[PDB]
Symmetry: T
Subunit: 68 residues, 12 copies
Amino acid sequence: SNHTYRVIEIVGTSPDGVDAAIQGGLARAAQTMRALDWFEVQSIRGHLVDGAVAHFQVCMKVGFRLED
Amino acid sequence: SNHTYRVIEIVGTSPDGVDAAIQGGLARAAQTMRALDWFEVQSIRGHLVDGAVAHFQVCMKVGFRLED
Amino acid sequence: NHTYRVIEIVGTSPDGVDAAIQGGLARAAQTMRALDWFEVQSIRGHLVDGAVAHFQVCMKVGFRLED
Amino acid sequence: SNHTYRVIEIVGTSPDGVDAAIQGGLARAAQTMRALDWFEVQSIRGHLVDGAVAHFQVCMKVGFRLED
Amino acid sequence: SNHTYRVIEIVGTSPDGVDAAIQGGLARAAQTMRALDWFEVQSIRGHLVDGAVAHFQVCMKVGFRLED
Amino acid sequence: SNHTYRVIEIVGTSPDGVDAAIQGGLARAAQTMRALDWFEVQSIRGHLVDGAVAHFQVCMKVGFRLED
Amino acid sequence: SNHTYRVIEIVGTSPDGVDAAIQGGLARAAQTMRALDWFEVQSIRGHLVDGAVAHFQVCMKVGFRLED
Amino acid sequence: SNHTYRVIEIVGTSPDGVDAAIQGGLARAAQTMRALDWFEVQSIRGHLVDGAVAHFQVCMKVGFRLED
Amino acid sequence: SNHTYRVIEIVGTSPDGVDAAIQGGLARAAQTMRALDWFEVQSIRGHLVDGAVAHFQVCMKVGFRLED
Amino acid sequence: SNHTYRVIEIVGTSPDGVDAAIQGGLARAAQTMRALDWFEVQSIRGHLVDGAVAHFQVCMKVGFRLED
Amino acid sequence: SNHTYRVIEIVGTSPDGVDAAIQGGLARAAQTMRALDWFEVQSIRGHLVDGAVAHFQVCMKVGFRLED
Amino acid sequence: NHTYRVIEIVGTSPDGVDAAIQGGLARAAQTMRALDWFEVQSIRGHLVDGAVAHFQVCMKVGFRLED
Ligand SMILES: CC(C)(COP(=O)(O)OP(=O)(O)OC[C@H]1O[C@@H](n2cnc3c(N)ncnc32)[C@H](O)[C@@H]1OP(=O)(O)O)[C@@H](O)C(=O)NCCC(=O)NCCS
Ligand SMILES: CC(C)(COP(=O)(O)OP(=O)(O)OC[C@H]1O[C@@H](n2cnc3c(N)ncnc32)[C@H](O)[C@@H]1OP(=O)(O)O)[C@@H](O)C(=O)NCCC(=O)NCCS
Ligand SMILES: CC(C)(COP(=O)(O)OP(=O)(O)OC[C@H]1O[C@@H](n2cnc3c(N)ncnc32)[C@H](O)[C@@H]1OP(=O)(O)O)[C@@H](O)C(=O)NCCC(=O)NCCS
Ligand SMILES: CC(C)(COP(=O)(O)OP(=O)(O)OC[C@H]1O[C@@H](n2cnc3c(N)ncnc32)[C@H](O)[C@@H]1OP(=O)(O)O)[C@@H](O)C(=O)NCCC(=O)NCCS
Ligand SMILES: CC(C)(COP(=O)(O)OP(=O)(O)OC[C@H]1O[C@@H](n2cnc3c(N)ncnc32)[C@H](O)[C@@H]1OP(=O)(O)O)[C@@H](O)C(=O)NCCC(=O)NCCS
Ligand SMILES: CC(C)(COP(=O)(O)OP(=O)(O)OC[C@H]1O[C@@H](n2cnc3c(N)ncnc32)[C@H](O)[C@@H]1OP(=O)(O)O)[C@@H](O)C(=O)NCCC(=O)NCCS
Ligand SMILES: CC(C)(COP(=O)(O)OP(=O)(O)OC[C@H]1O[C@@H](n2cnc3c(N)ncnc32)[C@H](O)[C@@H]1OP(=O)(O)O)[C@@H](O)C(=O)NCCC(=O)NCCS
Ligand SMILES: CC(C)(COP(=O)(O)OP(=O)(O)OC[C@H]1O[C@@H](n2cnc3c(N)ncnc32)[C@H](O)[C@@H]1OP(=O)(O)O)[C@@H](O)C(=O)NCCC(=O)NCCS
Ligand SMILES: CC(C)(COP(=O)(O)OP(=O)(O)OC[C@H]1O[C@@H](n2cnc3c(N)ncnc32)[C@H](O)[C@@H]1OP(=O)(O)O)[C@@H](O)C(=O)NCCC(=O)NCCS
Ligand SMILES: CC(C)(COP(=O)(O)OP(=O)(O)OC[C@H]1O[C@@H](n2cnc3c(N)ncnc32)[C@H](O)[C@@H]1OP(=O)(O)O)[C@@H](O)C(=O)NCCC(=O)NCCS
Ligand SMILES: CC(C)(COP(=O)(O)OP(=O)(O)OC[C@H]1O[C@@H](n2cnc3c(N)ncnc32)[C@H](O)[C@@H]1OP(=O)(O)O)[C@H](O)C(=O)NCCC(=O)NCCS
Ligand SMILES: CC(C)(COP(=O)(O)OP(=O)(O)OC[C@H]1O[C@@H](n2cnc3c(N)ncnc32)[C@H](O)[C@@H]1OP(=O)(O)O)[C@H](O)C(=O)NCCC(=O)NCCS
Ligand SMILES: Cc1cc2nc3c(=O)[nH]c(=O)nc-3n(C[C@H](O)[C@H](O)[C@H](O)COP(=O)(O)O)c2cc1C
Ligand SMILES: Cc1cc2nc3c(=O)[nH]c(=O)nc-3n(C[C@H](O)[C@H](O)[C@H](O)COP(=O)(O)O)c2cc1C
Ligand SMILES: [Cl-]
Ligand SMILES: [Cl-]
């Protein structure tokens, strides 16, 4: 037989930067999901409070292997 | 950093128009989902019957804050 | 089994997006048969006196080809 | 001689729908700008409060003729 | 009212080609999902081993009718 | 110093696959049109009947040389 | 008014350049079509012979107002 | 620090072609803007009158170095 | 309804990285603009000198609420 | 590790179909290139003769790991 | 039942225009490469010196038949 | 006057996006001359044990062609 994958979309956030947002988001996914394989960034965004980046926001597609 | 969002995709439908289709799709999401925050229209389509629009169909991405 | 044709039109209306969509499809319906679906390609409009004179909705329209 | 146009980007908002957001945004532009000619929609979005569309948000490119 | 569709994203795989990969992914979705209506290919990819295609990988959006 | 080409859009269909759907569409185009030169796939879609692919649907742009 | 427009797709060609390719195609559309209003360039392509550009090929969408 | 660039969008027009339209728009921008560095074409369009191109219209993003 | 936003485009730059480029561009915007609300990265580019990155350059759309 | 990959672009062709076109091109890349890892389909095109598909043409990006 | 094509990317430049920039790039490609078949413009850009276009820059994809 | 070549590479790094970008350009710099610019095409990564094993940044890299 042959594997099928599922691709969900999440947004990781961090006040520090793009990498921390990515990893922040993936950690929350890892808490409940198994067989996480890859991610792809869809967009990089952020919210500004008093002229400053309050949160970096990285929208990601996340691929994991489907269990039966 | 801590907050993570989930982005699901739905198609709202209505015979009345684009707004009606958007609000009908979102309304079904609100029956089961919590902390809904935003939507984005991916496309606007429709099925035609008797040379007129039977249903407007608006495809939407919908973001909500993930609970623990 | 069936082959479909996809043509591109622009429906316009001073009232809004729905009316523009419908205005355009109705003109298509006058001459074309077996119209099945549509997809909006863009939503534009012409402005006069700083207000929307016409909403213009570019659509692709799919209909089943006859023999 | 021959005309040049300027293309700015705005987001109109309304709690009623897409058309009202478009027109809401264009009215604010008209208050200060002259020779407004066309617009194109870049995206349709919205903010959700208690499962409901609080504001429809329509990001638009707006073209106007440049004065000298 | 009038239906709302849910649109999920999966990746079908097969060593045999694009069709088999497509039918492979959908067969896994059909094991657990009801009222599957349509699919759209997002991309066609593959992993290569020793200079030959090990698996075709077809990423699909898949739309089904939501139950209450 | 001369020729102009026309580009029309069709959707070929077939229960057998992507290739069959491509050829099925082009064959209909070949019944009436002359000097067909190239095609380009715009999208691969399909309708699902109780979990299986009923019809593969391949949307194509088809280019042909215009006669005077 | 509440006019409807038709958008067709053509490829104008010329050995001289992009401009010449655009007007070559539009002239051919102008031989049969009425109320031509606008064009939009989709792509700029060409064919190479002996390491030179034999023909510039400009693919255009051409919008015209439908008569009754 | 290190510079920030501003990126504006204009439409150059000319009855003569794409180059002249491009140079036309930039000449108007250069009348009032300083430290113009680059441009990128977004689209090439035109208005048609009596079956012929009245004006070429080239939409450009234009980047200049911000002063303090 | 009433609130309207403006979306300008800027390129932040830094020799240090992507985050640094983002924050430097936004910082220049905050010196003169008020009620900044969000940004979106349009692209990530850079200039190379001596076979290394002299400056990271992140192109950003930046939205702010229009005052009366 | 901290490997770097090279992505090249090829068009595989076959009169038989899409799958056959993909593997035709990959086999030619496999005749000279080492550590081929993945491909992504960019477009599916073809040439028409006598109203039939003479050659399926699949444009692919092909990623391989750079050696030292 | 055979040929494979290679697709490389170059940027032709010229102070005279888009066409000249296209031909200038292809001529360099013609100096070393054989069986050049087509090109496609990816983007039209340019560098500005004190308000005027210094160099038009046309990025192209260039396709040629691979020899054995 | 000058013609440029645009190649596509993927720089990787377990540390982040910048390090991935730089890791990739450095490998390019080992063999290529007159490297002038880069553009990021995508940011991806491989996951192991539910954490980022490698950040992968696909880039187009422009360099001036010699004669
Ligand atoms: C609601 C939601 C955010 C909760 O996610 P979460 O809190 O992060 O984690 P979940 O509660 O989903 O738990 C993960 C589930 O996937 C399962 N799972 C984890 N990895 C898996 C994988 N590799 N393959 C198959 N199943 C897996 C877990 O066992 C668990 O299943 P269970 O609940 O049946 O025991 C998420 O499930 C979701 O967004 N679902 C979609 C909801 C939707 O489509 N909305 C409808 C509105 S119209
Ligand atoms: C199946 C499905 C259509 C049903 O959606 P629904 O009828 O709108 O409601 P659900 O059954 O998902 O219930 C909502 C869930 O979200 C959870 N929830 C709601 N809002 C949440 C939020 N803000 N954060 C975290 N969890 C939330 C609820 O607790 C509930 O979970 P539970 O039933 O396990 O306790 C939908 O969940 C779905 O499409 N998900 C799976 C699709 C899929 O990927 N299938 C794989 C086939 S290959
Ligand atoms: C700040 C801003 C939002 C204010 O806009 P507004 O309140 O809606 O209206 P403005 O204050 O701009 O007034 C319109 C101006 O354009 C002029 N104008 C109007 N239509 C015009 C047209 N057809 N052609 C030329 N000028 C025109 C008006 O005369 C007025 O000029 P003036 O201020 O020199 O007297 C807007 O000007 C803007 O976003 N500018 C860009 C700021 C920017 O780039 N940010 C830099 C941060 S890095
Ligand atoms: C977890 C997952 C991989 C498992 O998928 P699966 O093994 O193919 O099938 P599931 O276990 O989800 O079962 C499908 C569910 O949808 C329901 N269902 C099926 N078709 C439906 C439809 N047409 N309408 C409404 N509900 C439907 C089924 O009853 C079942 O619900 P149940 O588990 O409460 O009984 C998949 O559900 C998924 O990717 N969910 C989203 C997880 C997610 O978003 N993670 C968040 C991490 S941040
Ligand atoms: C109506 C339609 C679906 C029927 O297509 P079809 O049955 O496959 O083929 P047609 O009946 O059009 O026949 C093809 C025509 O093109 C001509 N033709 C074929 N190749 C040609 C060529 N390369 N150069 C010039 N003419 C050519 C044929 O001679 C024939 O013309 P004729 O019957 O007037 O002599 C199709 O023509 C179409 O989609 N037209 C556009 C419809 C439209 O835009 N409607 C607007 C609604 S708002
Ligand atoms: C066949 C074709 C190439 C011939 O085009 P052409 O030589 O440039 O011009 P045509 O022969 O179509 O003549 C132009 C038509 O448009 C009509 N016309 C022109 N402008 C019009 C306008 N503004 N509004 C309404 N009608 C208009 C003319 O009356 C004429 O039709 P007529 O022969 O009934 O008088 C072209 O019409 C075409 O590609 N049609 C579509 C073919 C198609 O879809 N095939 C499907 C294959 S599956
Ligand atoms: C109004 C507008 C059309 C007029 O443009 P214009 O006639 O070509 O030139 P302007 O009058 O704006 O003059 C350029 C300004 O930029 C300044 N400037 C020029 N180059 C600069 C640079 N490199 N860095 C910083 N400032 C610069 C000039 O000093 C001048 O400022 P000043 O008017 O305060 O003296 C144009 O400025 C515009 O589109 N602005 C945005 C309006 C807008 O966003 N509207 C909001 C409606 S909701
Ligand atoms: C010229 C420019 C670079 C200077 O930007 P800057 O140095 O960052 O600061 P500005 O000079 O724009 O000053 C900020 C303006 O925004 C206004 N403002 C700030 N935030 C605002 C907000 N939230 N809502 C409304 N107005 C606001 C300020 O009052 C000020 O206007 P004023 O100087 O007329 O009183 C910039 O304004 C610009 O690029 N605009 C014009 C570009 C253009 O379109 N030129 C046309 C050439 S064809
Ligand atoms: C010219 C070309 C078509 C010939 O390709 P080909 O026949 O398939 O194979 P080549 O002749 O290049 O040989 C493959 C090379 O890759 C090298 N190689 C293979 N896999 C490798 C890898 N994983 N890592 C590092 N090197 C590898 C081989 O050593 C061989 O080089 P060598 O001749 O020094 O031993 C192709 O190399 C090409 O298109 N090059 C680019 C041309 C170009 O950019 N022209 C610019 C015009 S302006
Ligand atoms: C290095 C480079 C810029 C030089 O290009 P150039 O000076 O215009 O041309 P080249 O020196 O490569 O000569 C073209 C080669 O392709 C061959 N060639 C030309 N047409 C061919 C064809 N259609 N089929 C097969 N080979 C062909 C030529 O014979 C010559 O090969 P040879 O010298 O080994 O006999 C170019 O080859 C290139 O961009 N290569 C890829 C660089 C790269 O990917 N670097 C990785 C850094 S991480
Ligand atoms: C000029 C044009 C807009 C007129 O459109 P219209 O007035 O709305 O409708 P038409 O005049 O084409 O009439 C509809 C045609 O489609 C046919 N038809 C309707 N539905 C059909 C379907 N489902 N399948 C096949 N044929 C169908 C009708 O029989 C009629 O053909 P007929 O005139 O030979 O009897 C025309 O359709 C068109 O845009 N064709 C293409 C123009 C073109 O390509 N020109 C090339 C310029 S270079
Ligand atoms: C295999 C490959 C990755 C090796 O890359 P590498 O090890 O990083 O560097 P190379 O081995 O190519 O060496 C760099 C070349 O570019 C040349 N060069 C460097 N900078 C240059 C520049 N600015 N302009 C022109 N030439 C340059 C060098 O002189 C050298 O050529 P040489 O080997 O003839 O002396 C190769 O460059 C490649 O990917 N080529 C294309 C592969 C291909 O198209 N194969 C077809 C398969 S179907
Ligand atoms: C993906 C693809 C794109 C092509 N684009 C063009 C084009 O834009 N213009 C053109 O004239 N020919 C185009 N062609 C046709 C090629 O020029 C064709 O392969 C060539 O003319 C055949 O000659 P050969 O014997 O060298 O292979 C394209 C072919 C393919 C496969
Ligand atoms: C915009 C464009 C796209 C093209 N795409 C392809 C293609 O994908 N595959 C191909 O083989 N030829 C392609 N071609 C080349 C055409 O097939 C070419 O115009 C034709 O073969 C020339 O024959 P003719 O005498 O009928 O004009 C393309 C040409 C143009 C202008
Ligand atoms: Cl998506
Ligand atoms: Cl933009």
